[PDB]
Amino acid sequence: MDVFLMIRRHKTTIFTDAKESSTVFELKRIVEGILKRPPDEQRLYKDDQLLDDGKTLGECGFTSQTARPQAPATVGLAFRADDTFEALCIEPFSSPPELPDVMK
Amino acid sequence: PVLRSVNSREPSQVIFCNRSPRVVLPVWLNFDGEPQPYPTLPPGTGRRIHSYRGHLWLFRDAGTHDGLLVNQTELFVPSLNVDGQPIFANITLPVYTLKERCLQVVRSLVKPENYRRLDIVRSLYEDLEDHPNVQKDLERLTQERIAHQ
Amino acid sequence: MMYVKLISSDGHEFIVKREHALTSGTIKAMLSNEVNFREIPSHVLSKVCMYFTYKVRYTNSSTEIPEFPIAPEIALELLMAANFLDC
Amino acid sequence: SPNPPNLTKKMKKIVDAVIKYKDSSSGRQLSEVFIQLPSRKELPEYYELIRKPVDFKKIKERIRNHKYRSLNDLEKDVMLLCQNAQTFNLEGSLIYEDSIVLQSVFTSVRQKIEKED
Numbered sequence: 301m302d303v304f305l306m307i308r309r310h311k312t313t314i315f316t317d318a319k320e321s322s323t324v325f326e327l328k329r330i331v332e333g334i335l336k337r338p339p340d341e342q343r344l345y346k347d348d349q350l351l352d353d354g355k356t357l358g359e360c361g362f363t364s365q366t367a368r369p370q371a372p373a374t375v376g377l378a379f380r381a382d383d384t385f386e387a388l389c390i391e392p393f394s395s396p397p398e399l400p401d402v403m404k
Numbered sequence: 405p406v407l408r409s410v411n412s413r414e415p416s417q418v419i420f421c422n423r424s425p426r427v428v429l430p431v432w433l434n435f436d437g438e439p440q441p442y443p444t445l446p447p448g449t450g451r452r453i454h455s456y457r458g459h460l461w462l463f464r465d466a467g468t469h470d471g472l473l474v475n476q477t478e479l480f481v482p483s484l485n486v487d488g489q490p491i492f493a494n495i496t497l498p499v500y501t502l503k504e505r506c507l508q509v510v511r512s513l514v515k516p517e518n519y520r521r522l523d524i525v526r527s528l529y530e531d532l533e534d535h536p537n538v539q540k541d542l543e544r545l546t547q548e549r550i551a552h553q
Numbered sequence: 554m555m556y557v558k559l560i561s562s563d564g565h566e567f568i569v570k571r572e573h574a575l576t577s578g579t580i581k582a583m584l585s586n587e588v589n590f591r592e593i594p595s596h597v598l599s600k601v602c603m604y605f606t607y608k609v610r611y612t613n614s615s616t617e618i619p620e621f622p623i624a625p626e627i628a629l630e631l632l633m634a635a636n637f638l639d640c
Numbered sequence: 641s642p643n644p645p646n647l648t649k650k651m652k653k654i655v656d657a658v659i660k661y662k663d664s665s666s667g668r669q670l671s672e673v674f675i676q677l678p679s680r681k682e683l684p685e686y687y688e689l690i691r692k693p694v695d696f697k698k699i700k701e702r703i704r705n706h707k708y709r710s711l712n713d714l715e716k717d718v719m720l721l722c723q724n725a726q727t728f729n730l731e732g733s734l735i736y737e738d739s740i741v742l743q744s745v746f747t748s749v750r751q752k753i754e755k756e757d
């Protein structure tokens with residue numbers, strides 16, 4: 301079963317997919333191939349909770365119902381800064397304007 | 405006309421299955437290729453119906469007339485039943501273009517008289533006014549059949 | 554696996570599979586690895602990338618095709634982005 | 641020439657009961673499709689095949705104008721209607737099955753109405 305994700309860090313968003321049975325460590329290897337940061341230099345999060353390397357994406361709560369192509373699940377990403385990790389920081393997207401009177 | 409039902413007079417049992425989130429309007433093309441509206445199907449409902457060999461069908465959203473797929477294509481024609489087996493017609497949404505899907509959502513929220521009041525480029529007012537039409541899709545499908553020969 | 558970078562008007566960087574970004578005819582014409590969109594803001598460009606994934610996953614598919622959802626608040630801007638992007 | 645009043649009333653009672661008949665489980669009026677023939681413009685293929693087209697509207701008119709001289713003349717036109725629908729639509733169609741039930745309703749209703757007098 302495929303799961304569709306947005307791996308987000310600062311103003312960077314990676315759109316990717318993986319199997320529900322694949323692990324958090326295998327997801328860090330995908331990030332490594334894109335951003336050239338090794339797994340030991342990454343912390344992955346779901347709803348501000350740190351994800352264990354050995355857990356499957358399904359065990360973290362990423363399923364076909366919660367991580368859809370049209371509505372992907374967000375995975376927070378923090379990189380190691382020298383000897384310590386940076387704080388998890390995801391810059392929000394912009395906001396649309398107010399809904400017009402004709403659409404109400 | 406190229407796209408029409410044949411007056412075969414050969415019975416054929418069909419199952420119409422609405423696997424779309426839309427209220428479906430089955431459309432039967434008569435013996436002169438003219439589209440005929442049939443009773444609607446709510447989302448998730450299936451109905452065993454009687455039709456005939458070489459009879460041509462298409463499916464739309466009953467409220468907006470947006471085009472739908474049947475067995476992953478635009479047209480459905482049942483042949484004879486092999487040994488009394490019903491013919492299945494799985495009705496689903498197509499993968500619409502993002503532009504067409506945006507036009508659908510804007511038409512559902514804004515009334516036709518209030519389209520030109522929106523803060524958007526004027527080339528989109530004509531796109532919004534050019535509502536999906538069975539007759540225009542039959543021309544496109546006929547032109548595709550003539551091109552392929 | 555080749556990826557491309559799509560940058561919004563407000564500086565958000567969207568890294569998407571090359572094959573998925575080619576869903577857009579405007580991006581297809583530009584690529585033939587990085588693309589800057591001075592007029593498309595991040596809340597719209599993120600939604601465009603979700604459409605690219607949706608398009609590639611469900612075109613010629615046998616699984617049930619779900620509706621692509623669009624909130625009323627983003628519909629007008631997303632329409633203009635889709636019109637410009639040819640997708 | 642007029643028919644006896646008792647004959648014309650028996651004809652009206654049988655046709656009204658066949659027209660008003662409803663299914664025991666669904667409550668659908670089976671005669672509704674048979675009340676009026678489709679127009680010659682709507683369905684010319686019906687007229688190409690059916691030589692003697694007839695509907696419940698023409699049957700009621702024929703009772704009023706005394707064209708039927710007996711319960712058998714009326715029955716002939718109800719069986720003609722039902723056979724026309726069967727010949728045109730063929731087995732497997734709901735309309736074919738509805739016409740079979742209406743032929744049976746005509747005979748059950750006719751036997752009951754004749755036992756009253």
Ligand SMILES: Cc1ncsc1-c1ccc(CNC(=O)[C@@H]2C[C@@H](O)CN2C(=O)[C@@H](NC(=O)C2(F)CC2)C(C)(C)C)c(OCCc2ccc(CN3CCN(c4cc(-c5ccccc5O)nnc4N)CC3)cc2)c1
Binds near residue numbers: 413729
């Ligand atoms: C429930 C439901 N949910 C979602 S879709 C749906 C549904 C699906 C199917 C049907 C019924 N089937 C059909 O209409 C099939 C489909 C297509 O193949 C064409 N066709 C046909 O029968 C043609 N027949 C033929 O090609 C042949 F018969 C020559 C072989 C035609 C259209 C009669 C020329 C249905 O039906 C209910 C809805 C529905 C469908 C159509 C119509 C309009 N009709 C047309 C004419 N009709 C008839 C009247 C009489 C008649 C009348 C008076 C006296 C004597 C008579 O014999 N006899 N035959 C008729 N067919 C009544 C009105 C109305 C209601 C509902």
